[PDB]
């Protein structure tokens, strides 16, 4: 078959194929255009993707994720030790290198971060072969622009273990820029800002595109800021609301909190197309039916500091790239969270009314560009 | 009795159908829980036999939770009374099964 483009994301991975003069984003066995970067180990089987995530509440200690936060890193890395606090699975030292420790088929087994990412890449290869009805070997794999030599080689090895002929390792902001054909655009050098808010992380990059050649001028952003923070502020709002309305604290009923969280996650998404969102959760806590609403205006107020805080790395990137905000030729939006109208408004207001590149699905933009590069390299 | 209500009532019939399928698994686990308690297995072996049912009880809990999350997506207006009654009774049934699921958890891996 042909060459494919893979976005190997922290939480969700995405695969694309360029065909009939357009990039097609390949859906998985469960019909999803993004596959969770999850690997579960059980008494009888090893699960990858959606199957692995569907049983995460059943087998937390043996379901691995966030391997991208560990890939090509040392065990004593500041990033490694600080993220270990939040993982239900074990991260162990193996002569300076981190390994993930799990119980698999009754025995204690350890795996390197790239061995886990290779299981995730084998899945994306399979996903592409299941759609195309052809064998897939050639692939373009994306990595963030701040990834070092070790982090890049680890990702390259994850493709090698997965049985892929990695045509190129390219930067995620470069891929997003290729998706909008900012490198085909005529004229002098183009200074492009990439605003990546999605996949549990935030990354602002400044590129230079001169006659097809890309140059990374600066990288900024919060590593642990995403959609989950915007959900929390809605969950807190509702727990406080249920307290005022019924004088009950639902915060200790795990199932009730999960029911509110799932409804909040959906209500957030609705507020990108609608101005109002409605929630109806029967017998939420102690037989009390929770019938409520949340306006776009309210959601924006609850996340006001967080949304504004996305401009700090935009300013820090400009300072480091030695450029004025007026000197930016293009702004690209990537990651599910850029869908929020307030995030788009604040960034457009900052850039004195400049139109953002937002037509291509923000979740799929990096895979789109990777799929173009895979077809270019072939 | 609006036609648009039949769309919502059909969704609830499919959700109710799926609940019966999970309720059948809970009943089989109950037959195995009672099966070990009043069985031929030795005292020490029983503790292991009971705890081996832990993956399935958590699987049954998760499925009932995913059903609730789906019922929680439905927006049933005040006029749709028959749909709000079906949604209340199904949520109450799933929550009574979840209490039975918790009872099984209390009797295993102790
Ligand atoms: N509206 C919105 N905000 C954040 C993430 C999203 C992901 C998918 C659809 C909509 C989303």
Residue numbers in the entry:
A (entry chain C): 4 to 381
B (entry chain D): 151 to 260
Q: From the publication, what sentences describe this entry?
A:
The 70 kDa heat shock proteins (HSP70s) are an abundant family of ATP-dependent molecular chaperones, involved in many cellular processes including protein folding, prevention of protein aggregation, modulation of protein complexes, and protein transport between cellular compartments. HSP70s bind to extended hydrophobic sequences in newly synthesised and partially folded proteins, in a manner dependent on a cycle of ATP hydrolysis and ADP/ATP exchange. HSP70s consist of a conserved N-terminal nucleotide binding domain (NBD) with ATPase activity, a substrate binding domain (SBD), and a poorly conserved C-terminal domain which terminates with an EEVD tetratricopeptide repeat interaction motif123. The two main cytosolic HSP70s are the ubiquitously expressed HSC70 (HSPA8), and the stress-induced HSP72 (HSPA1A)3.
This change resulted in a loss of binding affinity measured by SPR, but surprisingly a crystal structure of 22 bound to HSC70-NBD/BAG1 could still be obtained. The structure, which contained two independent HSC70-NBD/BAG1 complexes, revealed 22 interacting with the Ser275 hydroxyl through either its N2 atom, or its exocyclic amine group, consistent with its lack of activity.
